[PDB]
Amino acid sequence: ACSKKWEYCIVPILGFVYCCPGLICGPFVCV
């Protein structure tokens, strides 16, 4: 599932989630 911008998403250097096309995960959220 794609994470929403002002939602929640962590990007650990081993495995991370993915936002919807257009948004990119950042500081435990998406932008």
Notes on the structure:
This protein has 31 residues and is an all-beta fold. It has one domain (1-31). The protein contains no helices and 2 strands. It has strands at residues 2-3, 18-19. It has a two-stranded parallel sheet. The chain is globular, with a radius of gyration of 8 Å. 10% of the residues are buried. It is classed as toxin. The entry lists the keywords beta sheet, cystine knot, toxin. The assembly is monomeric.
Keywords:
toxin, globular, Mu-conotoxin MrVIB, 2 strands
Brief characterization of the structure:
The protein has 31 residues and is mainly beta. The protein has no helices and two strands.
Number of domains: 1
Helix/strand/pairing category? mainly beta
SSE arrangement, N to C: EE
Helix segment tally: 0
Sheet with the most strands: spatial strand order: 1-2
Strand content: 5-15%
Largest sheet: 2 strands, parallel
> How helix-rich are the residues, as a percent range?
under 10%
Report how far the terminal alpha carbons are from each other: 16 Å
Count of extended strands = 2
Q: If you compute it from the alpha carbons, what radius of gyration comes out, rounded to the nearest whole angstrom? A: 8 Å
What overall form do the CA principal axes indicate? Answer: globular
Keywords: Cleavage on pair of basic residues, Disulfide bond, Ion channel impairing toxin, Knottin, Neurotoxin, Secreted, Signal, Toxin, Voltage-gated sodium channel impairing toxin
Family: Belongs to the conotoxin O1 superfamily.
Protein name: Mu-conotoxin MrVIB
Disulfide bonds: 2-20, 9-25, 19-30
